[PDB]
Design a binder for this molecule. Sequence first.
Ligand code: GTP
Lengths: 171, 75, 82, 69, 855
Amino acid sequence: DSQDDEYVKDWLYDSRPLEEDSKKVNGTSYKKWSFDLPEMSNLYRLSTPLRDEVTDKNYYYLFDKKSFFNGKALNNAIPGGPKFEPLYPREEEEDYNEFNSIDRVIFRVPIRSEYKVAFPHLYNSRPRSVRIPWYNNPVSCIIQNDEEYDTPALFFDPSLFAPLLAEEEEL
Amino acid sequence: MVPPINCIFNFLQQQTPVTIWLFEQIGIRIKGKIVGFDEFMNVVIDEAVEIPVNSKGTPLGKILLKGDNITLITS
Amino acid sequence: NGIPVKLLNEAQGHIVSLELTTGATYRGKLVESEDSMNVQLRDVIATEPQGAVTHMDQIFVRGSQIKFIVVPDLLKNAPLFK
Amino acid sequence: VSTPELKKYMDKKILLNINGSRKVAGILRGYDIFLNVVLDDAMEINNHQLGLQTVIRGNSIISLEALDA
Amino acid sequence: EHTIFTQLKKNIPKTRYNRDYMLSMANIPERIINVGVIGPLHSGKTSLMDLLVIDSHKRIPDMSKNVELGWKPLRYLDNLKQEIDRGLSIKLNGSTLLCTDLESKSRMINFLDAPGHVNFMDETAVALAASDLVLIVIDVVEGVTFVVEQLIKQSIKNNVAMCFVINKLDRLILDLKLPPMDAYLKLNHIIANINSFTKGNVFSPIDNNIIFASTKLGFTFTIKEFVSYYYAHSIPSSKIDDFTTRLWGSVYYHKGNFRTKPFENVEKYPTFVEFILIPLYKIFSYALSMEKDKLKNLLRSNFRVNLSQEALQYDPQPFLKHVLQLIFRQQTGLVDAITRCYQPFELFDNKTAHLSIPGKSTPEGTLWAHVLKTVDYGGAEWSLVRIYSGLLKRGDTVRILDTSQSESRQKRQLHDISKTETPSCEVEEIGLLGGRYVYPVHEAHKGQIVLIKGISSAYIKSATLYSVKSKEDMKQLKFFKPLDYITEAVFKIVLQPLLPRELPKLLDALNKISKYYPGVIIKVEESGEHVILGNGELYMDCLLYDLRASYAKIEIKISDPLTVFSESCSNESFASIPVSNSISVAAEPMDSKMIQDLSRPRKLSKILRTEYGWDSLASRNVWSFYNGNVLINDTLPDEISPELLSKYKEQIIQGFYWAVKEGPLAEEPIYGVQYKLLSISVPSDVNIDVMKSQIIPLMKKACYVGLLTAIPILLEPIYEVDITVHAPLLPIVEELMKKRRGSRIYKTIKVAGTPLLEVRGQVPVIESAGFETDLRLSTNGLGMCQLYFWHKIWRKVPGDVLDKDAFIPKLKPAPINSLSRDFVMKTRRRKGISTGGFMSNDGPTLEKYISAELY
RNA sequence: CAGCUUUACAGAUCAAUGGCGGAGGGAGGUCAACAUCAAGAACUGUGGGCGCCUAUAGAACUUAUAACGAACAUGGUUCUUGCCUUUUACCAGAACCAUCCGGGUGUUGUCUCCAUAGAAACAGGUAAAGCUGUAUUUUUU
Ligand SMILES: Nc1nc2c(ncn2[C@@H]2O[C@H](COP(=O)(O)OP(=O)(O)OP(=O)(O)O)[C@@H](O)[C@H]2O)c(=O)[nH]1
């Protein structure tokens, strides 16, 4: 439609693809691309159907490549994650010593596999070649497909010479 | 704190023996009773008396002494 | 705003020298300065115009009656001017 | 614009060095942005007190050197 | 001498201001603010420090292209592999910088970047101790969490000046996408919260205390700063302060050059919203959205800052960042705010008193300096020392104390009221901070913070240092106390190394850990089982990494993580029994309120007691508590007032001390008790020393007996549990909480202007074991939990100890009553008291426990 | 509304001194050939150009980390699983080399569009562009 995806429809579907002859690319060699905003936005919108990757970095807690590596080199897993050959020889033979007895320690936590990779150096003993994973902050966000913009939708409500741009703009 | 303006006001309210010193003039002083108040140090002071300083008394009427040449007040 | 004022402010802490209209030089730690050069100073000596010197604790001076202020030569370097 | 920071010297006896090579003493009671001084009275420097309390104009002050530490 | 110095200088980033000037300034106090930048986890305090660093320096070495552009942060004070790999700033890896103000009064500032994450309060505590001012930093969105409140509380105690940094405005503009009005409201709410948290001082954007920031993009402003940059043009100088004042709060401004009537007509949006927030919003929009040329034009007109040719070809987030940097200049405003905050030096004396008792200083005759924290800045050890008084030159021959020995020293001094210097040190190299280098200097001075290379051999953890020249000087001197590492440790990691050949190495490393990470009680128990009380899990992990890679470099086993348990009674005692080889004692558990008070002059003491727990006058008289544990000792028989045998208490309480240190059941410390002497059957023949010795055992025994009588219990601790979950995921969280044994939701608070439900809780530290991970997996990248122990709150392990029936399964976790005993037994086993695979617990003495309590 | 520089200029004398260089292009192309490749470049060396830039080459230390390439396939030796036994051909994991498929960077050429002086300024005048600007106690009534 001419309304929504106005900036692309003339060029989007073409061989090279198009935006090939302009200031928006290097040239016909077609190595470096540049864009304005609206077109980019349109493209993004078009994509969404395909590439809805949820990019709250926290979403990938224990699904970062480092985490996977750790899992691999601990012979440890995550229900959804993958599993491998054990990377070192599986040679336990603990021998229930003065330390790590049944009647010395208190099996209060189950100590699942999930933990062992999240804290490689604590829960796993002898972490050979195990990279330090991340630990990030929480996301507050709003992503919508409505007419109105820049409003509280689903938050919690609080308790209670022109300034330098003054009708240059409406916000 | 007691600001200078406030002090001046108080003095005015009272009507007490005020003895003014002159800026860059040692030998002379004034002695009277504060009647007026200004934004600056300027005031009107009725029943004033010019005094030669001890290194007596001299005749003088009602006067406004200008704020720029004031130094001391006491009341 | 005045750059000399700024300089004076910076000199706070340092041992500034300070002559007045009277011609009575002081030298002391600059305690506080204001836009009008209303200086306070600590541990301050006080030379008379004639010659004789007198030690004194915490002098205040009103910039109106100040003539010139000598600041230490370290402040030449930085970081006020640019 | 800024207030003269004399809150340290509040309620202490000060040598107000004043215009024409003269002096005043007395305990500090108040002040303003022009550096006028309101003080509970003392002598003019042998010596002789005048007044119960005194007010010194801003222009007149050379210095106000603290007698008390 | 000089060549080496030159070399050192060369291996360093050239600063934009001349470092000579800074050095000169440091020779004078009052031109040195020591600033602890502090806040919650991921506040963006490290980032802020990075901005400052950038401003200071011309070009940084490992500032990549991407970081320059403004993609990744360049957390310049993250330093060590641990931290960059991990995400968290972990140790107090600060920096020193000259900073001009609005009105360019340079001032050499000693910034120390705290860790946010709650299991590193140790570093935060250290920072607080060091720093006379503290920039608290807060996420806009996450809001003033409980953590921040706690910090505020435990910065009032220290004490310190509290500038705030409402950091992450971008998040409310772009993430929350709050309207400007809404944003303003949110800000106001935050401010109110902060004020509430505070006792005395009011904080606001006026009076320079709030510093609005977004470090990602990298702008801080205060309102004064803003005015200076962008509202001197349009207003006469005299009415600038007034304008600033107007700016904040319930104030409106209608078309009137230049009034500004509080309230009001037609179209709202307040002064702050009109003259600040709205402007910011516009800038953001334009930066992202608008035709670039028009934006440029606007910025020429309305800000007089030019978007360069290279900058115009940027991507958005970078471009936006660039724009904001152009607008709000190299962060002077923040510095100005800081300056305004710090009184100065009315507070400083008080702070010093708090650190090291009240008294009077001595400037010329001596120097003294708080050795705050050992570090590993340039690989090798330094001691981050603050010189309070005097000036500490290089090579100088110097006194010291670990503040383990501080109280004792004080006591000795008091008693006194030959020349024995107990330890010593030769100061090799003194340097400054920081981040990625140590600028070396010949002289440390009163006021400023330094790193010192000679110190470390003598001390461990907190330490004082001094250089007296007399008896009088010595008398005058005081000694800084050990730092209330607000959190306290609760979390056992029991170590074996894998090849016990290499135990020496481990020991060496362990000492380093103790020194380096200061929040770690390293007990080396008699069996061979080393034990490490970490603050918590992440901290422990970090420590392990440090040990298991750098300092030890050895394969090292670890236990499923435990706690400390402490001894306490439920009911009162019933029958005192003196033991022989002759005194008897009995204990009641003290009132909860009293305990709480303790956790946070005789007549005075009595009065206090009366105020707290409604103790009588006799009770007041009796009292004599100890250890900061706490337990309370009471000399309350009848004959004691006649008796001078009960007098000479100073001897008697030694046993009590021992008892408190290691209780009966756990062999692990007592807590929440009022001990009471009932009878003291002393014989006629004295032999005073012998008697004292006897008492020292006997008292402990008596205490144990009392505990046994009073229906004793292990006290587990409870982690207070912040969780910042997404609103609709709270049910999941609740379910999770339910699933484990100890767990409780004390409230669910709505973080205004966000989708976050800040749900404070409690969880016992053995139930913790990775709880954060569990929370994060379940909740799908939402609800960043934290666990912590600021309070020192313990609880009943739910059930009766001393029951051989107990439990069924060896391998599994046991039911709650059963667990009440199980832990105790396990603890005993660990200690090396019970001997065998199966055993029991019982208390002598005596007479077969009084014939099993008369059947 | 004042001033200074910078272009267009008029007609200068004409130094004069500056600056402008005594003139060498700007683009791009699925055009090549050639080197040199994480960015770094600290610190040193040795150039041009002024306690300092710009080029070079030399290690240091960086982190690499996620992305010379938001890409990922294939070989070989060795070690270990496992097919098993045997050949390929493989299962599934390590270590160290190699292989393609792509990539930039400058060096140069070559092929299609855009350009375009051979000098200009002094003394100021005209036009525009850029920065700095009201007396009553602390500055100049
Ligand atoms: N949207 C937004 N993100 C920010 C802002 N400030 C920082 N961040 C991001 O959130 C994280 C916080 O910054 P950090 O510097 O890591 O926080 P920190 O001060 O190191 O936290 P500690 O390590 O606990 O001291 C980083 O990933 C930043 O990129 C902001 O103003 N807005």
